[PDB]
Amino acid sequence: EVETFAFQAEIAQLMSLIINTFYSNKEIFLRELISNSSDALDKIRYESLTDPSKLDSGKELHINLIPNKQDRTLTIVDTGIGMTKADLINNLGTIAKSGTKAFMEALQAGADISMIGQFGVGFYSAYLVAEKVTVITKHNDDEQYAWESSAGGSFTVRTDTGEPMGRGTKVILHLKEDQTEYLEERRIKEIVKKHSQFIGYPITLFVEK
Ligand SMILES: C#Cc1cccc(NC(C)=O)c1
């Protein structure tokens, strides 16, 4: 049972600008997704300060980076607060319509693309390197769901029957054919050290066979 939704016109426009604009500094996608994970971890930590049972779904607060060269995927896993189905449909828990407007007004006033995260829409920088993005998420108050989009104006949401997650979010980047440098250990390490070296949660880069 798969539900298909249209992106709001402003989000479709942002996504097409990310995909079509010539812009060589693609590595910022990983900074933005790690930042989103750190925000999601801060939220479940804050909730747990007054209600410890919010961590019954998992006490460890961390970020894992999982490259898979056979599948040509880079997966960013966090054990943050996760998203409900309603959150997924509402632009993955963002204020993407007003954020896109503020981002585009900022660019007209002298910002560049790499400030995208300041406007709350850093998630969509995934499309700098991915032809398809899958988001698996589990929030304490809802069931496990899978969101998916190859851009083109639409996304799908379905109940996820895969590996139970406990709590958190998994962003699976199905990489473009010419973007496989982001699966190499030395390249990922370089980017994490350059852009994410002070994130307050452990970031573990998995290795492959
Ligand atoms: C990449 C990219 C991107 C994201 C938002 C807006 C724009 N448009 C420009 C710079 O003309 C480009």
From Swiss-Prot:
Residues 1-209 are annotated as: Interaction with NR3C1. ATP binds at N36, D78, K97, F123. It is found in: Nucleus; Cytoplasm; Melanosome; Cell membrane. The modification N6-acetyllysine is found at K43, K69. ISGylated. S-nitrosylated; negatively regulates the ATPase activity and the activation of eNOS by HSP90AA1. Belongs to the heat shock protein 90 family. The TPR repeat-binding motif mediates interaction with TPR repeat-containing proteins like the co-chaperone STUB1. Molecular chaperone that promotes the maturation, structural maintenance and proper regulation of specific target proteins involved for instance in cell cycle control and signal transduction. Undergoes a functional cycle that is linked to its ATPase activity which is essential for its chaperone activity. This cycle probably induces conformational changes in the client proteins, thereby causing their activation. Interacts dynamically with various co-chaperones that modulate its substrate recognition, ATPase cycle and chaperone function. (Microbial infection) Seems to interfere with N.meningitidis NadA-mediated invasion of human cells. Decreasing HSP90 levels increases adhesion and entry of E.coli expressing NadA into human Chang cells; increasing its levels leads to decreased adhesion and invasion. Homodimer. Identified in NR3C1/GCR steroid receptor-chaperone complexes formed at least by NR3C1, HSP90AA1 and a variety of proteins containing TPR repeats such as FKBP4, FKBP5, PPID, PPP5C or STIP1. Forms a complex containing HSP90AA1, TSC1 and TSC2; TSC1 is required to recruit TCS2 to the complex. The closed form interacts (via the middle domain and TPR repeat-binding motif) with co-chaperone TSC1 (via C-terminus). Interacts with TOM34. Interacts with TERT; the interaction, together with PTGES3, is required for correct assembly and stabilization of the TERT holoenzyme complex. (Microbial infection) Interacts with herpes simplex virus 1 protein US11; this interaction inhibits TBK1-induced interferon production. This is Heat shock protein HSP 90-alpha. It comes from Homo sapiens.
